[PDB]
Amino acid sequence: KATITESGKQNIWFRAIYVLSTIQDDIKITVTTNELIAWSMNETDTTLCQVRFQKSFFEEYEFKPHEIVFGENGVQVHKLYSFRVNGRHLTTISRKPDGDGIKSFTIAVNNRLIVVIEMDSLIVKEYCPQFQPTERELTSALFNEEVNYICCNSTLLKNFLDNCNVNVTDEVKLEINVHRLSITAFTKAVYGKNNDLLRNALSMSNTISIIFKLKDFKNFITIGPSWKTTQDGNDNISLWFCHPGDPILMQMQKPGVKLELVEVTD
Amino acid sequence: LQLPWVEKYRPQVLSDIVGNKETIDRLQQIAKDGNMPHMIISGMPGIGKTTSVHCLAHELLGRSYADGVLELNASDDRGIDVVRNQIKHFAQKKLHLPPGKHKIVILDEADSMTAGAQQALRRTMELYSNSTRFAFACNQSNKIIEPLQSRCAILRYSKLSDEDVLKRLLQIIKLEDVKYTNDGLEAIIFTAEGDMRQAINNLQSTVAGHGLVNADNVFKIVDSPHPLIVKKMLLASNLEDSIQILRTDLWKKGYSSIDIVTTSFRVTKNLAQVKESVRLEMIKEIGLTHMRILEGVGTYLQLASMLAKIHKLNNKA
Amino acid sequence: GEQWYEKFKPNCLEQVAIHKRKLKDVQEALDAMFLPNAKHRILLLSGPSGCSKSTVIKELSKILVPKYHKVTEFRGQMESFSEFLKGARYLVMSNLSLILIEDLPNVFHIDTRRRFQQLILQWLYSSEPLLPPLVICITECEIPENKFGIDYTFSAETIMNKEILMHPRLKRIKFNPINSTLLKKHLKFICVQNMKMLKEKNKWNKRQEVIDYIAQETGDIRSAITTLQFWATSSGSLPISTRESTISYFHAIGKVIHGSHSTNNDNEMINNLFENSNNLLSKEDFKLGILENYNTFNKGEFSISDASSIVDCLSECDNMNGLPESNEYGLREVRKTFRNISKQGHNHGTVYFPREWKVRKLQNSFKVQAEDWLNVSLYKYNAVHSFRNITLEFGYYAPLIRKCQ
Amino acid sequence: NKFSASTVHLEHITTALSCLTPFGSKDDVLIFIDADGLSFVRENNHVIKIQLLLSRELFMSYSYRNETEDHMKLCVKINHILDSVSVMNRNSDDIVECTLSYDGHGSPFVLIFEDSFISERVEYSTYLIKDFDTNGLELDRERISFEAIIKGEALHSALKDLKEIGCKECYVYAKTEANDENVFALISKSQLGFSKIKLPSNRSILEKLQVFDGDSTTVIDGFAVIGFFDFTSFDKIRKSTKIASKVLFRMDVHGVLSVNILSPGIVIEVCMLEKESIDEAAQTEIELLMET
Amino acid sequence: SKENLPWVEKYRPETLDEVYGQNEVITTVRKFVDEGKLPHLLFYGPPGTGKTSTIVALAREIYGKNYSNMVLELNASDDRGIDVVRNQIKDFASTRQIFSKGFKLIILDEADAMTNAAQNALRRVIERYTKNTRFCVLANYAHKLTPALLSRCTRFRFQPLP
DNA sequence: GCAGACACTA
Numbered sequence A: 001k002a003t004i005t006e007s008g009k010q011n012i013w014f015r016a017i018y019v020l021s022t023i024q025d026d027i028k029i030t031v032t033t034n035e036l037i038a039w040s041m042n043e044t045d046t047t048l049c050q051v052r053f054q055k056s057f058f059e060e061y062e063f064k065p066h067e068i069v070f071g072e073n074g075v076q077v078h079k080l081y082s083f084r085v086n087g088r089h090l091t092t093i094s095r096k097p098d099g100d101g102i103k104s105f106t107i108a109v110n111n112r113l114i115v116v117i118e119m120d121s122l123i124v125k126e127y128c129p130q131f132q133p134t135e136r137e138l139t140s141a142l143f144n145e146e147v148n149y150i151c152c153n154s155t156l157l158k159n160f161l162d163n164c165n166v167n168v169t170d171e172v173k174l175e176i177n178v179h180r181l182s183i184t185a186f187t188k189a190v191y192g193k194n195n196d197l198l199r200n201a202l203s204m205s206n207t208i209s210i211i212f213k214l215k216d217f218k219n220f221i222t223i224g225p226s227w228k229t230t231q232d233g234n235d236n237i238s239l240w241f242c243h244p245g246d247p248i249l250m251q252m253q254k255p256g257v258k259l260e261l262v263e264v265t266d
Numbered sequence B: 001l002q003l004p005w006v007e008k009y010r011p012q013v014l015s016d017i018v019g020n021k022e023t024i025d026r027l028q029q030i031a032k033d034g035n036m037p038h039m040i041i042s043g044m045p046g047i048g049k050t051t052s053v054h055c056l057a058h059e060l061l062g063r064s065y066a067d068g069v070l071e072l073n074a075s076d077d078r079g080i081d082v083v084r085n086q087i088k089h090f091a092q093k094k095l096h097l098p099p100g101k102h103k104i105v106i107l108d109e110a111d112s113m114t115a116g117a118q119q120a121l122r123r124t125m126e127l128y129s130n131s132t133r134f135a136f137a138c139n140q141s142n143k144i145i146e147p148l149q150s151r152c153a154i155l156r157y158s159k160l161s162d163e164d165v166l167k168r169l170l171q172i173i174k175l176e177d178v179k180y181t182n183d184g185l186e187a188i189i190f191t192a193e194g195d196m197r198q199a200i201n202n203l204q205s206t207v208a209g210h211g212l213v214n215a216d217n218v219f220k221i222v223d224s225p226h227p228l229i230v231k232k233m234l235l236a237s238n239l240e241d242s243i244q245i246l247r248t249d250l251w252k253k254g255y256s257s258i259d260i261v262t263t264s265f266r267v268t269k270n271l272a273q274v275k276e277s278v279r280l281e282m283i284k285e286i287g288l289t290h291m292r293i294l295e296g297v298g299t300y301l302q303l304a305s306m307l308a309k310i311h312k313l314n315n316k317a
Numbered sequence C: 001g002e003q004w005y006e007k008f009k010p011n012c013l014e015q016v017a018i019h020k021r022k023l024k025d026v027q028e029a030l031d032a033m034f035l036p037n038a039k040h041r042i043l044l045l046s047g048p049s050g051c052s053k054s055t056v057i058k059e060l061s062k063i064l065v066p067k068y069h070k071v072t073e074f075r076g077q078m079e080s081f082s083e084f085l086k087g088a089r090y091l092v093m094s095n096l097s098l099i100l101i102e103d104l105p106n107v108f109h110i111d112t113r114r115r116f117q118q119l120i121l122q123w124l125y126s127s128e129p130l131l132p133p134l135v136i137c138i139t140e141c142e143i144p145e146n147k148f149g150i151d152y153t154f155s156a157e158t159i160m161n162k163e164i165l166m167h168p169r170l171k172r173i174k175f176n177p178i179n180s181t182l183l184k185k186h187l188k189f190i191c192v193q194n195m196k197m198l199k200e201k202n203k204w205n206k207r208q209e210v211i212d213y214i215a216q217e218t219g220d221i222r223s224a225i226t227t228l229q230f231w232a233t234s235s236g237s238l239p240i241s242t243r244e245s246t247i248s249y250f251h252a253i254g255k256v257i258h259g260s261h262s263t264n265n266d267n268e269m270i271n272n273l274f275e276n277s278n279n280l281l282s283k284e285d286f287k288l289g290i291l292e293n294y295n296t297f298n299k300g301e302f303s304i305s306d307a308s309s310i311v312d313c314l315s316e317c318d319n320m321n322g323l324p325e326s327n328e329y330g331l332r333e334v335r336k337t338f339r340n341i342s343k344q345g346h347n348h349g350t351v352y353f354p355r356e357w358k359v360r361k362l363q364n365s366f367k368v369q370a371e372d373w374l375n376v377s378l379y380k381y382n383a384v385h386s387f388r389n390i391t392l393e394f395g396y397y398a399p400l401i402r403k404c405q
Numbered sequence D: 001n002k003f004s005a006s007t008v009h010l011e012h013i014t015t016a017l018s019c020l021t022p023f024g025s026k027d028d029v030l031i032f033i034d035a036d037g038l039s040f041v042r043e044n045n046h047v048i049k050i051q052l053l054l055s056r057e058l059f060m061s062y063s064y065r066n067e068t069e070d071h072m073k074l075c076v077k078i079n080h081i082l083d084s085v086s087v088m089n090r091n092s093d094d095i096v097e098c099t100l101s102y103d104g105h106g107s108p109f110v111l112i113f114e115d116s117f118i119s120e121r122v123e124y125s126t127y128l129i130k131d132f133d134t135n136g137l138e139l140d141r142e143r144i145s146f147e148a149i150i151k152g153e154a155l156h157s158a159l160k161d162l163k164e165i166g167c168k169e170c171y172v173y174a175k176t177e178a179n180d181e182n183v184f185a186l187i188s189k190s191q192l193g194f195s196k197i198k199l200p201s202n203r204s205i206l207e208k209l210q211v212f213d214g215d216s217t218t219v220i221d222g223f224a225v226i227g228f229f230d231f232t233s234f235d236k237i238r239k240s241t242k243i244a245s246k247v248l249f250r251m252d253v254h255g256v257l258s259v260n261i262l263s264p265g266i267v268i269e270v271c272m273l274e275k276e277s278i279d280e281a282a283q284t285e286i287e288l289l290m291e292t
Numbered sequence E: 001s002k003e004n005l006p007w008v009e010k011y012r013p014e015t016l017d018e019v020y021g022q023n024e025v026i027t028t029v030r031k032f033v034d035e036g037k038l039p040h041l042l043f044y045g046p047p048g049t050g051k052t053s054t055i056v057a058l059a060r061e062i063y064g065k066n067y068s069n070m071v072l073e074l075n076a077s078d079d080r081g082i083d084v085v086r087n088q089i090k091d092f093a094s095t096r097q098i099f100s101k102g103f104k105l106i107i108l109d110e111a112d113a114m115t116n117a118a119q120n121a122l123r124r125v126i127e128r129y130t131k132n133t134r135f136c137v138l139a140n141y142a143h144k145l146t147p148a149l150l151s152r153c154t155r156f157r158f159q160p161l162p
Numbered sequence F: 001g002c003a004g005a006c007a008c009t010a
């Protein structure tokens, strides 16, 4: 595999890989001829974050699944190769240096991941992280695109997300009410020995069912403003069937990047 | 630039290692078959534990020793988070080994490692038992927690006997082509008291300072061990003989009083041919003398009074 | 090759080395938990190392989850565990996944253990509809020499500060070491599984004594399996070394008072006790245990001279500033005098922990009461009398003077 | 006064002292006064030695009245100086004049700062009892392994990229080819795996690079030089290369490395120590990856 | 200048010939250094017998002008915590010698006053980093030293001066 | 090592 990109997509790529690293320390990266797949399954089995990079994201897609000899565990029949690497290892590699820019970036696999960085000047940085070829566990993607209609603006939602003091790590309550979406983020008070407040209840709400995570939602929305999308780049979507038991489905369409997210409710 | 005899002749194969013949043979079968289980080795220091582990790893790996070992020693950043991350990264890699071979991780001196690091180690072994293996090196197995000892095979190491140490001395002498004497070798063994490294150091000192290995030269360069003198003077019948022995040995050779008290306590604890009441009375007197010395009164008069009280309780008037 | 204890992992419930009463108790507790009316919010299962703790929950959740994956084991920090607990809170419907807290996060630091305690308290008192089942497994094993709880003995009572344990929504079931009969049966099962390799070498005819020694020497099934595997793989003539266990706090007092049946001679037993358990016999509030428990040798029917000598020797030992020699002398004297007077010994009394914490609590209560009395007296008028004279004169006369007036 | 010096532009002095704070902030700097100028040397654990030199023309009132062998030493604690100077030298364009004074021996190091009719005067008592003198990790130029001159900005960017990766052990590579495709890189290994930062053969950042054969006159092509250096020294030097114009690299066959920093500007020379031996037979796999 | 110092410090020996009493130890260490072989010497004895004076004279004899940057002297006056010990001695021993083709000598005065973990780290460094770096142990008390340290280090006893 | 009460088949 040899995929090279020369554009300002390094910011969105680093943001997505940082999101995946924050969700899970280990990131399972599966490469197929159709597109590029990156995901990191949660330890609690409640988070499924999917990001897809089309062939138009890069300038070349010289991938040869038939020539893979070492690591046949991750090679299964559309033949594709799957491997897992630590998120913190790669996030500190795809970072943008301060006071400098990167004009060329590519990722490759040898027969020990072969990833290199070429900045604006001639100086280049090469890294060889260790991966592990796993068993193309794409049944989660089968459930994700197994498949109401809610659409809303994303910049005010992002402002609400990053001014709500996520340090306390409260929960979010999607209150649809009647017609207007009122995004709320509060925590549930807990009783003590005799009606004591062991944990303080910090509640805040504003007006423009299901309860889901807050850092997953923030990480999913951070992908949008990171990349300047003059063309297309429509707002996020929310899909969820009846009853709170089933997980929710979200999608953020972009011309070269596909966003999916599954969060289990209750 | 000549390496010392201790480090110049470090064994590289399990055949050169002497001592516990059964354990060495078992290690050889483990290396040959390749089935390497989790192991903990404990015993007297300087008897060939870390050397045996290194030889076993070498014989099991061969050309895979470049990456297949992660030797984390005591003299390292032995924390709770960086050690866990390093071991996790070591266990999350695969190399081209035969199916009967597995990666070996060596942790010398695991006694001083923190208990949280022990729990992290247990998590790593539970998560990645199928790929990598762990080999422990230590002096005693008490400091290792029970759950970690449960997931391993314990092989206690005994002190090296006269035959193995003498055989190693003969091989090293033949390698160095050094004139020796049987009485000198007996004196070397007596001074070593089962220690291999101490015996090698004493032989090196004898050959450097005097050349020919003789009992007189060995006694001149290094004195007899103090526990033997303590045991000799403690079981003496007459008070005058014990007083003279303690004086002419310990005060003339320059032995600290607190060291004498500690050695006497160890000897009394390890004494055999004494009654329980006499042993506990002597232990109490040793504790009183130790308190007196620790406060600051550590003269010869205190030791003489301690011996006088010991002989008084022995004779019972 | 693969380890025997992993290759021979049980599949059915009958294969697990668990007692019938223990299995019934854990089954009833779990079944009570899975009803909508949750009697116990959390399940705590303490016990020694390798007494088949986690496997019980594993196969139980295997057999019960389809009735109404298997578990969600948390990998071994602070905010990661908070997020894990919050995510486990939102796993109730259509999954019914049990929450396992085996191999709990780091607690040797004060801050992380405290935040663990507040997390446990917060989840225990959460008045939220429905409940995801949760099981906590704690291994009882003391930390060797390297205070006030941790670094002395790592167990359930060390981590939890007497608040989680004293909760209605908890079922504390301590686990016992694996039975000798069950260990022998499981070792025989391994042997009849490995018949071919057993017949390969000359080990079948010398099997019964080895199995009996392994079963009677240690109570850990995993350590016994590892020892059996090492013995079978070895050609022969190799002495077997087991997983040396630990001696409990009351077990040490029982061994010191009565003695040891395995070792008749006192010197070797005392030396082994000092070597293997130096931390327990050198740490404080242990001589108090002997001083409070020596009366139960014959239900207080022995000679007064022996007791007087015992307490006098203990006073001399305390005079040596807690030196190891003092502890050795005191233990040796106690063992010697009990061995001497054990010629007529029957119906020994039960042992107890010394009443040291209650005295400290009462002293603290007296101190705060005296501080309050000084405060109110100083507010009323000018009266200072230091602190020494209060307990002798003002601790009794002033209360009755105030009450009468 | 034996030694006197005055300056008006303290920005240069404070930005030179900021390059010494990562390791030299603790104590034990041995200031030298001579006809050449003012120099500071720091050496901890006898593993790394730094020399920062101030020329005559930097000071405006350099007198240097002496009647001796013209070499006087003094040792002062850096942390006290940093704590004293942190509160002053504030704002911008404060025209803080600094006056240096030292009365030979037995007198404290005296600094006078004046800022808008407000003067300050701090006395720094010295430590000259167990001064063993001599010292210095010097190297001979007759057997230099190789010489290299690189730009300061590229080295600073490389070090600032290498620091946050980790890489507790680092390697230094030297290589020359007949087609003028000179190779110079500072690779390292960490828990992440392998980290390779490469300085290309472009003369903008690799103006001069030649590998010698231990005689400092016989330049050869096709020979590789391996330098095993600890992460600590590179981390300490990263701050010193933050502001610079040209950086000179020069180590001999003994393994000690002298790095010269140019920033007229002042000169900073730092001497390093190589590790005792390469890890097993690693150097082979360093080249095997280098032409890979 | 001299002639203004206490006689204890004024009469400090500078050469091995200036050390009296322990003729056997002096001859043995001279034979050791004549062959270029330093087997991790350990010195034990009562105070005032000339342990640190002997090691200083030996270092002067075998090095000369290299004492300023080859000998690492550690003692009770310097902090010897576990992290400090491991970092300092690892950095000193792992680094190659500058120009001299001889072993590196590290002197540890008052080695009895260290923690058990620090002693374990020191004894691991002694066996690990020993190709070019040697160790010297000075202590008047042996009960505070780990018995493993006494095995790897050759013990020399300083008798009271006759 | 102690006691108090229960397991389990001869």
Ligand SMILES: Nc1ncnc2c1ncn2[C@@H]1O[C@H](COP(=O)(O)OP(=O)(O)OP(O)(O)=S)[C@@H](O)[C@H]1O
Pocket: B006, B007, B009, B010, B011, B016, B017, B018, B019, B044, B045, B046, B047, B048, B049, B050, B051, B052, B138, B139, B168, B196, B197, E127, E148, E151
């Ligand atoms: N059986 C043996 N045969 C030959 N040489 C031996 C033997 N045992 C020890 N030695 C020598 O003693 C040296 C030290 O051995 P080590 O294995 O380092 O000691 P140890 O058993 O690990 O105990 P430590 O290191 O004090 S915790 C080796 O390098 C050998 O030179």
Ligand SMILES: Nc1ncnc2c1ncn2[C@@H]1O[C@H](COP(=O)(O)OP(=O)(O)OP(O)(O)=S)[C@@H](O)[C@H]1O
Pocket: B146, B147, B148, B150, B151, C004, C005, C006, C008, C009, C010, C015, C016, C017, C048, C049, C050, C051, C052, C053, C054, C055, C056, C102, C137, C139, C186, C221, C222, C225
């Ligand atoms: N018949 C058996 N019954 C129970 N466990 C068995 C049996 N045969 C093998 N084992 C193994 O023995 C171990 C027992 O697991 P547990 O003791 O429940 O784990 P644990 O509680 O974490 O042990 P510790 O205290 O952490 S060492 C597992 O690894 C099982 O696979």
Ligand SMILES: Nc1ncnc2c1ncn2[C@@H]1O[C@H](COP(=O)(O)OP(=O)(O)OP(O)(O)=S)[C@@H](O)[C@H]1O
Pocket: E007, E008, E009, E010, E011, E012, E013, E018, E019, E020, E021, E022, E046, E047, E048, E049, E050, E051, E052, E053, E054, E138, E140
């Ligand atoms: N063999 C000797 N002959 C003559 N003077 C000696 C001899 N040994 C020691 N001294 C004198 O003793 C002084 C102090 O001895 P040191 O060697 O510095 O201390 P020490 O003997 O090592 O004892 P400590 O407590 O371990 S520092 C020296 O300065 C000498 O004057």
Ligand SMILES: [Mg+2]
Pocket: B049, B050, B051, B108, B137
């Ligand atoms: Mg060892």
Ligand SMILES: [Mg+2]
Pocket: C053, C054, C055, C102
């Ligand atoms: Mg388990």
Ligand SMILES: [Mg+2]
Pocket: E051, E052, E053, E109, E138
């Ligand atoms: Mg001294």
